[PDB]
Subunit: 224 residues, 2 copies
């Protein structure tokens, strides 16, 4: 129904969709689609390190790179079945849990281009929807806004909030998602500079998965 | 160079432009353009009332309506020269000071469609520009975003941040500003329902003024 970019105060809705396309929600979707038991978003590197135990992998990034002592970084390509099947993923990224903590909703799901059609189908029967973009370092995230616009366009609703309308209009101006993000996203440029251009291509590849991660008691999981 | 909508933490930049089109910055521009000595942003109604004294007018809104005890509301049409010329305007709006507090910049100006061209001309020689949209009650503000996009398109810089690129593309999709806002801005629709339709038309009128309000040590003035 509406889109918010990096909210500052608690946002209320019935159905919330978390978007951190350049990797975070793409990592969440990829990990769960490849067998991970669950993905637990955590705020700091320190607390992430305190959660080490058998069957658990400490993952994430800061400055887009894997922190010292961690198992995996925040590149979705690292989350292969042979590496994370049956494991619980403790994930801490730059946006920590900033977005999640401000969401006051009955349901919270994770979206990326990777599972876009599944997300759209799930949302068609939902009311009071808020697409919550995490943003980049508290700034506007082009890739998050683009995914939000793609979703809005396909929900075909008529009660669009300012954010949803702006996102849809922006989406309509895009000729090619991949090219658009590589050329105009600041975070995408940072990722490319660090050798992660492959991540941008993977993260913008639509529908490689048909899953819809749900946040249940602080853990993103797959459920019926 | 970039656009931010209702920032949460302090944003640092060399040059900042505050945007609260539906009234706040339109009121600030209108007031100074009509003779006001300055416009002082104030946080609470309690504080605004205390500053009452000869030569000062207490103005602002809460729920878009003029608070009890106040001289003027937040309708730019109220700031006529015959009423405010030479007086200091104490202005408190819903989240006015909260937004200004997030701007870590030595150079802060206010913009509206009312002084669009003057603002663009002012920014021509400016580097590291951040257009700060106030937003409405924590939500995205279409009218602020549209003005930001209009400014970005006029500057034609070779370095746009994510927000500026999105705002520019959005601006390019709009054929008519007044109709776009009346049809798609939740806040504009609320204002219309409260009887402020004239404000929507006035605030989206381009270049009625050629002034550029500057926040100088807590007070918006015309250098």
């Amino acid at each position: 129904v509406d889109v918010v970019m990096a909210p500052c105060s608690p946002v209320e809705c019935r159905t919330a969709v978390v978007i951190d396309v350049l990797r975070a929600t793409s990592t969440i979707v990829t990990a769960l689609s490849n067998g991970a038991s669950g993905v637990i978003p955590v705020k700091t590197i320190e607390e992430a390190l305190e959660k080490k135990k058998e069957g658990v992998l400490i993952c994430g990034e800061r400055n887009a790179q894997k922190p010292k002592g961690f198992n995996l970084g925040n590149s979705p390509l690292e989350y292969r079945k042979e590496k994370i099947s049956g494991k619980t993923i403790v994930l801490t990224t730059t946006n920590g849990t900033q977005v999640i903590e401000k969401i006051r909703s009955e349901e919270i799901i994770a979206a990326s281009f990777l599972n876009l059609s599944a997300v759209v189908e799930y949302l068609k029967s939902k009311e009071d929807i808020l697409l919550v973009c995490a943003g980049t370092n508290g700034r506007f995230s082009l890739e998050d806004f683009l995914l939000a616009g793609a979703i809005v366009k396909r929900l075909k609703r008529n009660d669009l909030g300012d954010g949803a309308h702006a996102a849809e209009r922006y989406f309509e101006s895009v000729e090619n998602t991949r090219e658009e993000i590589k050329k105009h996203s600041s975070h995408a440029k940072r990722l490319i500079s660090l050798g992660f251009e492959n991540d941008i291509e993977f993260c913008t590849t639509e529908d490689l998965f048909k899953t819809v991660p749900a946040l249940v008691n602080g853990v993103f999981i797959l459920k019926e």
